[PDB]
Curated annotation (Swiss-Prot), chain A:
Domain comment (free text): The MPN (JAB/Mov34) domain has structural similarity with deubiquitinating enzymes, but lacks the residues that would bind the catalytic metal ion.
Role: Functions as a scaffold that mediates the ordered assembly of spliceosomal proteins and snRNAs. Required for association of BRR2 with the spliceosomal U5 snRNP, and the subsequent assembly of the U4/U6-U5 tri-snRNP complex. Functions as a scaffold that positions spliceosomal U2, U5 and U6 snRNAs at splice sites on pre-mRNA substrates, so that splicing can occur. Interacts with both the 5' and the 3' splice site, as well as the branch region. Has a role in branch site-3' splice site selection. Associates with the branch site-3' splice 3'-exon region. Also has a role in cell cycle.
Residues represented out of the complete protein: 1836 to 2069 of 2413
Organism, as annotated: Saccharomyces cerevisiae (strain ATCC 204508 / S288c) (Baker's yeast)
Name of the protein: Pre-mRNA-splicing factor 8
Mutation effect (D22A): Reduced growth at 30 degrees Celsius. Strongly reduced growth at 16 degrees Celsius. Strongly reduced growth at 35 degrees Celsius
Other comment: Present with 468 molecules/cell in log phase SD medium.
Organism ancestry: Eukaryota, Fungi, Dikarya, Ascomycota, Saccharomycotina
Binding partners and assembly: Component of the U4/U6-U5 tri-snRNP complex composed of the U4, U6 and U5 snRNAs and at least PRP3, PRP4, PRP6, PRP8, PRP18, PRP31, PRP38, SNU13, SNU23, SNU66, SNU114, SPP381, SMB1, SMD1, SMD2, SMD3, SMX2, SMX3, LSM2, LSM3, LSM4, LSM5, LSM6, LSM7, LSM8, BRR2 and DIB1.
Gene behind this protein: PRP8
Residue numbers spanned by region RNase H homology domain: 7-237
Effect of substituting D22N: Reduced growth at 30 degrees Celsius. Strongly reduced growth at 16 degrees Celsius
Protein localization: Nucleus
Curated annotation (Swiss-Prot), chain B:
Miscellaneous field: Present with 7330 molecules/cell in log phase SD medium.
Annotated effect of mutating S236 to D/E: Disrupts interaction with PRP8
PANTHER family associated with the record: A1 CISTRON SPLICING FACTOR AAR2-RELATED, PROTEIN AAR2 HOMOLOG
Gene transcribed to yield this protein: AAR2
Name the record gives this protein: A1 cistron-splicing factor AAR2
CDD domains the UniProt entry points to: Aar2_C, Aar2_N
Family, similarity comment: Belongs to the AAR2 family.
Disulfide bridge map: none
Species lineage: Eukaryota, Fungi, Dikarya, Ascomycota, Saccharomycotina
One cellular component (GO) term of this entry: U5 snRNP
Amino acid sequence: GAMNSSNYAELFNNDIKLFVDDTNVYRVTVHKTFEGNVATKAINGCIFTLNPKTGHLFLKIIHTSVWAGQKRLSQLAKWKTAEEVSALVRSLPKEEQPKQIIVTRKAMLDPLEVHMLDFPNIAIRPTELRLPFSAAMSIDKLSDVVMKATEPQMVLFNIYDDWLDRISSYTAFSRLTLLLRALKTNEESAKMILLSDPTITIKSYHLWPSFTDEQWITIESQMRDLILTEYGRKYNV
Amino acid sequence: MNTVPFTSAPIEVTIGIDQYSFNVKENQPFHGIKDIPIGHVHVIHFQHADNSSMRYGYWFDCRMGNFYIQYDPKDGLYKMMEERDGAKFENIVHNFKERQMMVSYPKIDEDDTWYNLTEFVQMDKIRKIVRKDENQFSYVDSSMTTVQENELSDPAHSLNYTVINFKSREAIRPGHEMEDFLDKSYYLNTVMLQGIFKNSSNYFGELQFAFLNAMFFGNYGSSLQWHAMIELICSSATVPKHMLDKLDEILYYQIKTLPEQYSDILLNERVWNICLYSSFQKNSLHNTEKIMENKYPELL
């Protein structure tokens, strides 16, 4: 059944699993037409498929061409997501295929279950957790590759850079969720905190700056402060 | 008109014949039911006064032989049996009739209720859902599970309804996942109608049989089958016009006949609301929508 606070450690055991987030699959800007009616223009999207244990990110770029002449796009987006995740599982060798797929949004369960009928041994699971994977398009290098795509494209990343050389998955995932939670609450402040010191750079093959263990503690603290500050603004508490 | 004689009534029991029912007292001189219309299936059903647990009954067609009921004090139930000796049977019946120890199947002449509930139900098809080929009649009770319920425990005592599963390879063509799940027309028309049932009549017969088993025995698996078969039609964008018009009539009589006090357990909120208000066919069940709205507005 559902992934929650109680069965959280399961994410870091040795059963291959993937999180699927469909939030950024169908993306529009709403604008006024000449006649003063409202219209949407789709921009490139992505499926966010993450192995929380290894940090392997399967970023499937959703080119605006997939929507051309299609109706009910918010509905189609869930089925196109399920179709791409299914095709990704099929493309992996057997011993690399997930035993579980956790969808961050319940509306993905039926589309994914129907596309995965060929895989009755892969459990499709919701989660009670409010994960901030929507903020994935606040990571500059992920946003850059999505907006520049001219066709459907799969791009492979490690969303933990080289962190697993020094910390456990559990800790890496907590760091990733704190970074994404901050970027989601206040992108400007979050990004300012990450690049405030020009001496700490992002390696060409990385997403995040090369912080020493002590600089991560300080960054992690600044991110928690940002989240509480913003919380005491939203709610005036 | 045909007769189902009773050897005796040794235990107090509510006896049902189709939509009619009669209380019989322990050792009341009851010798059965006469004037049963030829041309339809019938069901004769029982609920012991001493244990309302286990409604149970026999589907039969009087054209297929001479049937009587006899209490078995070993198995503790009223059993249907076939009398192969035609002249012994006619002789037994003629005695009980002369002594007027038989209730009359109490059909009002204006009343097409039983025809309307059993229009497509065929005794030879019942015998394939309820397998016991040494008898021409079919035993059903409250607790019998469906083949599908057993998949998710004794196969001899199963209801072999046609398995319907919206999230099965059978229901969904590879490469038409979204289309086949959101519009089940493929599954209804090619798999179920052309493939398994051969025609709309056989499909309606099983639907009507599932309903009656749900209503007369409170059989939960039959209720699930009745809802599934309704939902597959209502969730199909493409259904022949004749099937839609017939479905509206079928369902009208089922909702009309349901005990008012059983709507809570026999009717599935999600299926009905979806079928009447959301589905492709939301506008094609005028009679059914009018009677449901006027008779069970709470459920909606």
